[PDB]
Amino acid sequence: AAEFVNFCDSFNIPLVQLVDVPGFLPGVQQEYGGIIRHGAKMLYAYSEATVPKITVVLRKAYGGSYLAMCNRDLGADAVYAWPSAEIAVMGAEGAANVIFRKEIKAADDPDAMRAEKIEEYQNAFNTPYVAAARGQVDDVIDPADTRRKIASALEMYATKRQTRPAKKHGNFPC
Amino acid sequence: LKLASTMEGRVEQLAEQRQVIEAGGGERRVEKQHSQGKQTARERLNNLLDPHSFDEVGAFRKHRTTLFGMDKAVVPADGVVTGRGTILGRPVHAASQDFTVMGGSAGETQSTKVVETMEQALLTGTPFLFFYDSGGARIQEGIDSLSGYGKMFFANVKLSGVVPQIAIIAGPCAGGASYSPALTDFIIMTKKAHMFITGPQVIKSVTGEDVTADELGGAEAHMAISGNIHFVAEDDDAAELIAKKLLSFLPQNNTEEASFVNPNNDVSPNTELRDIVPIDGKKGYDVRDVIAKIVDWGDYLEVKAGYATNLVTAFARVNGRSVGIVANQPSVMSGCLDINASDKAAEFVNFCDSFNIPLVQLVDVPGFLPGVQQEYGGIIRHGAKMLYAYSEATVPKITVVLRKAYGGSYLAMCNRDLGADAVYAWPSAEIAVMGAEGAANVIFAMKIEEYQNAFNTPYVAAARGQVDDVIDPADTRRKIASALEMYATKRQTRPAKKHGNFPC
Amino acid sequence: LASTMEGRVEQLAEQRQVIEAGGGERRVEKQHSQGKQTARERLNNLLDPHSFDEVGAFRKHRTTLFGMDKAVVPADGVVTGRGTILGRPVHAASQDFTVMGGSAGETQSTKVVETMEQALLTGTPFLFFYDSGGARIQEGIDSLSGYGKMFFANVKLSGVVPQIAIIAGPCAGGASYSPALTDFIIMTKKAHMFITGPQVIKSVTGEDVTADELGGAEAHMAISGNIHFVAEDDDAAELIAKKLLSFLPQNNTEEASFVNPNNDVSPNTELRDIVPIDGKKGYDVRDVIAKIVDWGDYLEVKAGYATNLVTAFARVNGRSVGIVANQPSVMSGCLDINASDKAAEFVNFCDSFNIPLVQLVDVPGFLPGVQQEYGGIIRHGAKMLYAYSEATVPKITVVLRKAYGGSYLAMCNRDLGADAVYAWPSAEIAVMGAEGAANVIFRKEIKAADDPDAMRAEKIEEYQNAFNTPYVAAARGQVDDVIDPADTRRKIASALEMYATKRQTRPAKKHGNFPC
Amino acid sequence: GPCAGGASYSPALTDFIIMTKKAHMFITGPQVIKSVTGEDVTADELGGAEAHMAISGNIHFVAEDDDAAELIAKKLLSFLPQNNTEEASFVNPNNDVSPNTELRDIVPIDGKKGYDVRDVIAKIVDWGDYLEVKAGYATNLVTAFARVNGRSVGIVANQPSVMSGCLDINASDK
């Protein structure tokens, strides 16, 4: 991803992201292989890129892997969420289990409470509407309009002129 | 909070409130932090910065989140202490994550305080240092915590190559939070810290592997295996010392060359250098002994000392000037360059170039590490990083060929074609497109010697202009010193571009 | 939510329709009953059909105190996005008065700033319809910070992309500073604007004033000098916005696209008769303007403010030009504090956006008056000299008649950088009127003359002929040529054509010190 | 001395006008004004230094005479750089930034009570030294040059003791 992003940026080619990522691949070898410095390349490439960057979240958009797919914080000029978009810092189930660990354990009926808290977390953070509420996405869109949304964003950002701090070059992760 | 009734009373109330904020998560949690051999967030800043230089921003800054108990949670400084101070009189900006406050979780506002501090560093052209100590995202804040990380990552990249960024991992650094340190220039990790993208729980649940936090991402793991960090520190005290030593070699920002420090202007011959490199190619040595006799006071700060030890990268000084030394380590894997060493060198070269630090190469490389996994691991694209970094670099590049300099690995060590400004060959230098045998073997009882003398002697390299001179090893320091003096005014023009295509 | 994508898509349409309904049926009917369009109708009418691409319809405030935690505030009261106007990409914002009175929510201001930043980033104009009862008190300092961010953004965009403010409802308190920081304010007769309202003013000063008298469109136009166009209603404001925009480039890197050029520059002998030879007689300088600009078309700026000076956008051979002309039919064409501001602002704006400046000069001096001195005519008139001196666009000056002292310099003569200066045969460039001059320099001679009256007339005529004819101005090089009024359009057109490739630079500086 | 008519515009275009009490300035003089408007005003009431300072807002310093004007010019110049490429040279730096508890008492807790903001300024600037600009115009706002650790700084401060510290048209220009 990083090499492609860097190249496109070098030659003024806009970048369009289609996101459906559940996170980074769990594995001792991913960690020992330096996923930290390798994954950082995507964050660096997108953060450094100044060509128009358009992102469409199709479905899953979890943690750092969603940031790596260039969200607004990484400079995406336009971000759209399909109704199935699930941008989240963590799944509702896992989040509810931790947040309400105590409440659930001590509850007379854990199952009812847990499911209760999960749906609560789910609706509080992980729907397209919350991502839109926070401005993380420009709009929640009908999947059928995706081409138009991207096309319109590309047309408006065809005149994008973005400044970067002066430097010989940043320090691209190795 | 209701304001007091008198100004003196409000001043007392202010001091009381500030003491509360400064208490972080409380005596118990602070004692817990201490019992773990860790300093608190504020102690770290106090030990890192010059006495009383810490000017804090946002002590009273508070999260704005309200869901899932945040509305009633008291979270001092939102878990991060940020501000400006000086290190040896040099202005710097810093952040120090407070694990005692909600486990140092990345609150939205917390990340915002950090980004703001970073923007300040960028705005004023000063270094930025960050002590990381966090249990991860603040799940209670959902996507707000997530967005905070994004803003921080973008900021790390914005400051990249503009002002030095040093990360100090002194506790947990769980999850994507780790990408921030990855985006800074140097990570100093203590033996009490751990870092990873996916933790043991998820790794166990998903892959069935049950490993500990330390085995997965302890300091030793990141240094030797992962290649993620640049220094391992015994504890916070040592990390702070390293941070200061490291910073001493760096300029405040990319518009300056680092200030000279305790220059040793003596460049007289040192015959000791003639004896470190064995005339017998089969015998190795510690290239750092060569470095030690070349640099001022024999002082150097080795970067990534425990990673890809077949290649040494270290900051040192010549006549007080910071320089970056890249040297093949013949005592490890025969000094062969490999995937990991290529990354180690490239990152160092790129960084030095970004901050106007001249690069000094000590060459003794037989070639790249032969191996199927090296090819399958992409030695082609990884090794290309060295060629790219050096070819792209415009700082003075001084290369001394100590012994072996074979094929592509020699080019990767920055010869004149890659822009080295001065290249010197020791009497033991063996610059070859290929070794005497194998070359004659391929070209042709009967020829190896004929080939060896016709191409691989220091004098042939000199005859072709590939080295400027063949030198008495004892004069290495003076030749490097003189070259650095002359090229201190080097102004090399490069084609305009947003950036080149650095190999991944 | 729904189980199928189709279901979720219908759910999305339903929720969007709810957001678009704003404050609801009754509040919308109330808005309409007040002769006002809704926030969404305004964008739908300003922008090319269906071109509006909305950002943040689902954006929500994050504030929770004092009811905000439960309040449903659609789009946080501002509709923002991009669209096109005659195919030109533009960014726009439209405050929704039906949503919490269009109060300036923190998130609302952020949405506006974000849109402004997009306009800056893409180099497109930014238009904003204001309709707000004020700060969102429930959000306290968060609403306050929102305003600061907006003001900083208006300044950031200033001189980079044109900013057009359309006040189409209330715009109370400090909120008014945003429009003040844009380039042009078009205010409808339904709107009101002021820093301090009638209530506070009464409580504090005892002064009795209605909202309409204090901050209605007419008061701002004619008295305060705060706005550029008065619109009958939203439909008219929308037409004005488009008309104004048609003269402007997308940003400061371009010159405005030519529109419907009339390339004919035939003489028009009627021009010889508009300006009376009799200096004590006036005329409407717009009659001169009408005969020299393409199709007689011009859009006067601040038409109802300081009418002693006319500033208007027009075209010559299709090219946008800014015309600055003294109005002899008003206050004898004297410049004064207000006209100085009116002129300087227009000159400064045209310069920022590469619009040539054409001056039609007939000025006898500055308005005499103790309040003109006390009001600081020195520092205000200096604004014209500064704006013209700093300006680098082509500056073409035609001296129709009087051009006295500093007022003439303020109308951009050659010394202030005019690239071409033409004098009609009636031009009277003088450091001082002949009568005043002769009475001063020949005071002793006239007084000691046998016939002081004949002597004065003789000296006045001598001074007049020695310095104040267009031939002496031409003799000294102050004008390029003395021209037949009938050829004015061609002369101006030709000068604009030759100076179309003018490249002029200024000394490096953050900025000069523009007079306050 | 006199500075009659359009000549006044040159001083208006400079940065600071120091006007002696022996000088007069105006675009139109009392004569012409009397003729055209019938208004009665003396040269001194119309364009003397105090009128320009307090009414018109045209000048920055009122000087008793030439010796005083010369001292003010030197004092003013001492805070300024030679040109826009430099920061003014430091002058007699006072590096003591020890706390001064008196500052806790200058501003009344009672919002209805005013004070002279310059008492606050005097305690925070080097040696209590400051050169007030337009000292007699829009006194509801103070603008003064001073130094902190020898560095020239411009201080803008509301003056609660004048019109409750409200900003107004004139103070905004000032």
From Swiss-Prot, chain A:
GO terms for biological process: fatty acid biosynthetic process. It comes from the Bacteria. Residues 1-156 form the CoA carboxyltransferase C-terminal domain. GO terms for cellular component: acetyl-CoA carboxylase complex. One of its GO terms (molecular function) is acetyl-CoA carboxylase activity. Keywords: Transferase. The 12S subunit specifically catalyzes the transfer of the carboxyl group of methylmalonyl CoA to the biotin of the 1.3S subunit forming propanoyl-CoA and carboxylated 1.3S-biotin. Homohexamer. Transcarboxylase is composed of three subunits: 1.3S, 5S, and 12S. The core of the enzyme is composed of six 12S subunits. On each side of the core there are three pairs of 5S subunits. Each 5S dimer is attached to the core by two 1.3S subunits. Thus the total number of chains is 30 (6 + 12 + 12). This is Methylmalonyl-CoA carboxyltransferase 12S subunit. The chain holds residues 351 to 524 of 524 of the full protein.
UniProtKB/Swiss-Prot annotation, chain D:
The 12S subunit specifically catalyzes the transfer of the carboxyl group of methylmalonyl CoA to the biotin of the 1.3S subunit forming propanoyl-CoA and carboxylated 1.3S-biotin. It comes from Propionibacterium freudenreichii subsp. shermanii. Homohexamer. Transcarboxylase is composed of three subunits: 1.3S, 5S, and 12S. The core of the enzyme is composed of six 12S subunits. On each side of the core there are three pairs of 5S subunits. Each 5S dimer is attached to the core by two 1.3S subunits. Thus the total number of chains is 30 (6 + 12 + 12). The lineage of its organism: Bacteria, Bacillati, Actinomycetota, Actinomycetes, Propionibacteriales. It comes from the Bacteria. This is Methylmalonyl-CoA carboxyltransferase 12S subunit.
